[PDB]
Amino acid sequence: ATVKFKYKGEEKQVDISKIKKVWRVGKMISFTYDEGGGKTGRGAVSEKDAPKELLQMLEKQK
């Protein structure tokens, strides 16, 4: 599965494996995906824009 964001009509895309951490703050949702250079590319996607299999990691306990 993959998650897509939405910044000013700019639907972004990042593989779930490319992502690193994910934590929903208040109502929106944020995370840290590795762009591919050296600086972590943080991102703030919305709750409706996030798929349904994304909160899974937030409630994934081993």
Side-chain angles (χ1 to χ4, degrees), residues 6-23:
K6 220 197 215 196
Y7 270 113
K8 220 152 212 200
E10 215 186 54
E11 301 159 55
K12 271 205 168 212
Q13 197 174 45
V14 184
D15 275 320
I16 180 161
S17 278
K18 242 153 169 82
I19 301 177
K20 265 180 148 199
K21 274 190 149 162
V22 190
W23 64 102

Side-chain angles (χ1 to χ4, degrees), residues 17-38:
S17 278
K18 242 153 169 82
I19 301 177
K20 265 180 148 199
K21 274 190 149 162
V22 190
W23 64 102
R24 63 188 231 320
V25 185
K27 269 207 270 222
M28 271 186 90
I29 296 172
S30 297
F31 33 48
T32 69
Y33 54 80
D34 214 298
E35 214 178 322

Side-chain angles (χ1 to χ4, degrees), residues 53-62:
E53 274 174 69
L54 201 71
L55 292 157
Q56 248 282 29
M57 264 214 283
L58 202 102
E59 262 215 312
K60 251 290 150 157
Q61 221 215 304
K62 209 266 160 268

